């Protein structure tokens, strides 16, 4: 019954938190990547090619 959250205001609310939720994903991405020294991802980064 998630219809309670369906309306104009809720839609404005979602847009307002978008940049924040996006940036929070940027943090989690780099966060995992750096913490596991992601071979796959890190190779693209200049200066972090310690091989």
């Amino acid at each position: 019954m998630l219809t309670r959250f369906l309306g104009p205001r809720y839609r404005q609310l979602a847009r307002n938190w978008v940049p924040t939720a996006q940036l929070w994903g940027a943090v989690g991405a780099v966060g995992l990547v750096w913490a596991t020294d992601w071979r796959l991802i890190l190779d693209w980064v200049p200066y972090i090619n310690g091989k």
């Binding site: 309670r4 369906l6 309306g7 104009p8 205001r9 809720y10």
Partner: protein
Amino acid sequence: VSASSRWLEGIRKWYYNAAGFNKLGLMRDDTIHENDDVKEAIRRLPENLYDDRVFRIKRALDLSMRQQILPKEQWTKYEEDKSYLEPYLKEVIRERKEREEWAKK
């Protein structure tokens, strides 16, 4: 109206007897699961109903304790089953949904 209504009504009267709360002297609305809407409606009941409701529930809990049941004579007959709480609950739901509509704008 005809055979049709009676059939559904008798299917309903059958489940009722099978549900079996009437054996504990209870009423349909006494078994309602208490949530926010329900708590408020219980709150809005006038003195008399609220008192009767508590005694009914007490009679039942007491029975369900010793796992006995009421004499057949005193079970609560379908028909004779008062939906005392319904109108209150409906209004409590009807109130909430208004806030909920207002919250969308």
